[PDB]
Amino acid sequence: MDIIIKNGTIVTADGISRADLGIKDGKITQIGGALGPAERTIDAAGRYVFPGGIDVHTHVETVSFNTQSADTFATATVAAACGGTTTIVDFCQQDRGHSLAEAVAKWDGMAGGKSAIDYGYHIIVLDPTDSVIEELEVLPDLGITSFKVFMAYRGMNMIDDVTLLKTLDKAVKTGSLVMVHAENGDAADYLRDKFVAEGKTAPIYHALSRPPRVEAEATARALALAEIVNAPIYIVHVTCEESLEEVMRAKSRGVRALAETCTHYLYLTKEDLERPDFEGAKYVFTPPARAKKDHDVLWNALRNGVFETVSSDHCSWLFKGHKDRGRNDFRAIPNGAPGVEERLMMVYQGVNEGRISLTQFVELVATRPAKVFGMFPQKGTIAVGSDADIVLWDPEAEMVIEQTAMHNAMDYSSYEGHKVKGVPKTVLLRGKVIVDEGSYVGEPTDGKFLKRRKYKQ
């Protein structure tokens, strides 16, 4: 027995039991009973033993407009671990004019031997060449079973209905799942330019230039297209009442529509973009921050089991280095905010306030995502046979989130100042302790790529 975790309360999505764990060769081999001798023994007394967090929506390392993101695959995964997240599914981005394979290879270069935690890939298709699209017949067998496309971001990521339909079609044939950023780009452009023309350049206009309708329409269209092709689809970052409604309408018609939300959409509002002295720039992410009523809508949807997970959509644009190129034009502000580390703690506060149950926390934060994106049961819960990806949670620990205490390469936190109750203490990745009582103690060589399974839905 390599490791034994005793005196803790094992909390899975469908179980709560005070028992001891036996880890052997990166896997959980025994729960309860006589465990025997063990190299190391961890005392989880007064703590929860949760499955490791699984963030299926990250942009760990990116290059936007010749400039690079503050975080790298190494700096982000370390923060992820310190935040209780042991698996991540980053968005492998294709380069215009290049192949998907060229993209995967590029990603391997960034991840290989540098990820503190395990990782899988989603493939972004932003240059739908006949050959590129034909590659979707190949990537699945490499363990990349989810294709992602954008309906916004003209001349950068945006593709059209013809493309989406072709992607939906290839996904059905290869048993893959299409993911989509649903915003009507043209509608946004129209408003963005109209605002700038009127001399309106503050961060707030990032939100006003792309109101709920922009998201709602695109969402509905994508779902409609999925219905036509008769394919499963996954709507990333559903952020407001109107777009959620379309997802709901699609589900009732029988469309295999799936959706998710992201931490910040349960806590931030467009008013945050009005914080003085360009601080609002920090909250310039897409879709735009909504309103508090949307927070209730989303939390209720969570409690009712509507969403598949609460991911982070983690980005790293230095407030100083990157957000800066926009102090005079919100359009130039690189979109995105950090949160891969804070995800669990923030979502967990919902169990503290009765918004969501303790058991649902695990479902949303790890088990359900794992199921959808083909990593269950190897990843996701805590059962015999599971990789020993574990988080020892202290439900009573109180703390204020400060970027100075975070573990990535950013110059600010989206949750700076938030008081939380319930903190990740020590983390295990396939049996190895990578975070011990708050200190990262792993190797950038620990993380491994995950060939994810097909037929998602």
Numbered residues of the known binding site for Zn(2+)? 57, 59, 148, 181, 237, 313
Q: How far apart, in whole angstroms, are the C-alpha atoms of residue 12 and residue 30?
A: 15
Q: Closest Cα to residue 61, out of 453, 451, 454, 444?
A: 444
Strands (E), 99-239: 118-124, 146-150, 177-181, 233-235
Q: How far is the CB of 73 from Zn ion (least distance, A)?
A: 16
Is 64 exposed, middle or buried (CB count within 10 Å of its CB: 0-12, 13-18, 19+)?
middle
Residue 383 binding its own copies, by CB under 8 A: yes
Residue 97 binding its own copies, by CB under 8 A: no
Q: Which of 47, 122, 181, 368 binds Zn ion (CB under 5 A)?
A: 181
HEC-encoded secondary structure of 159-193: CCHHHHHHHHHHHHHHCCEEEEECCCHHHHHHHHH
Report the binding-site residues for substrate. 153, 286, 335
- Residues contacting Zn ion: total by CB under 5 A: 2
Q: x/- binding map, residues 184-223, to its own copies, per CB under 8 A?
A: x-xx-xxx-------------------x-xx-xx--xx--
Binding to Zn ion (CB under 5 A) within 299-318 occurs at: 313
Q: Give the number of other CB atoms < 10 A from CB of residue 449.
A: 18
Nearer to its own copies, 76 or 306 (CB): 306
Residue 387 binding its own copies, by CB under 8 A: no
Q: Closest Cα to residue 351, out of 339, 363, 341, 340?
A: 363
Q: How far apart, in whole angstroms, are the C-alpha atoms of residue 367 and residue 309?
A: 9
Residue 133 binding its own copies, by CB under 8 A: no
Q: How far apart, in whole angstroms, are the C-alpha atoms of residue 297 and residue 237?
A: 14
Q: Closest Cα to residue 120, out of 102, 146, 94, 99?
A: 146
Given the rule CB under 8 A, which of 94-102, 312-320, 337-345, 383-391 is the region that contacts its own copies? Answer: 383-391
Q: How far apart, in whole angstroms, are the C-alpha atoms of residue 258 and residue 369?
A: 11
Locate 355 and state its tokens: 């918004």
Binding to its own copies (CB under 8 A) within 155-184 occurs at: 160-162, 165, 169, 184
Residues 6 or more apart in contact with residue 434 via CB below 8 angstroms: 81, 116, 117, 427, 428, 440, 441, 442, 446
Helix (H, G, I), strand (E, B) or coil at 282: helix
Binding to its own copies (CB under 8 A) within 247-266 occurs at: 248, 251-252, 254
Q: Which does 313 bind (CB under 5 to 8 A by kind): its own copies, Zn ion, none?
A: Zn ion
Q: Which does 161 bind (CB under 5 to 8 A by kind): Zn ion, its own copies, none?
A: its own copies
Q: Give the number of other CB atoms < 10 A from CB of residue 165.
A: 15
Q: Which does 377 bind (CB under 5 to 8 A by kind): Zn ion, its own copies, none?
A: its own copies
Q: How far is the CB of 5 from its own copies (least distance, A)?
A: 12
Q: Which does 431 bind (CB under 5 to 8 A by kind): Zn ion, its own copies, none?
A: none
Residue 229 binding its own copies, by CB under 8 A: yes
Given the rule CB under 5 A, which of 134-142, 181-189, 297-305, 434-442 is the region that contacts Zn ion? Answer: 181-189
Which positions lie near its own copies, rule CB under 8 A?
Answer: 10, 12-19, 22, 28-36, 160-162, 165, 169, 184, 186-187, 189-191, 211, 213-214, 216-217, 220-221, 224-225, 227-229, 245, 248, 251-252, 254, 296-297, 300, 304-306, 357, 359, 362-363, 367, 371, 376-377, 380-386
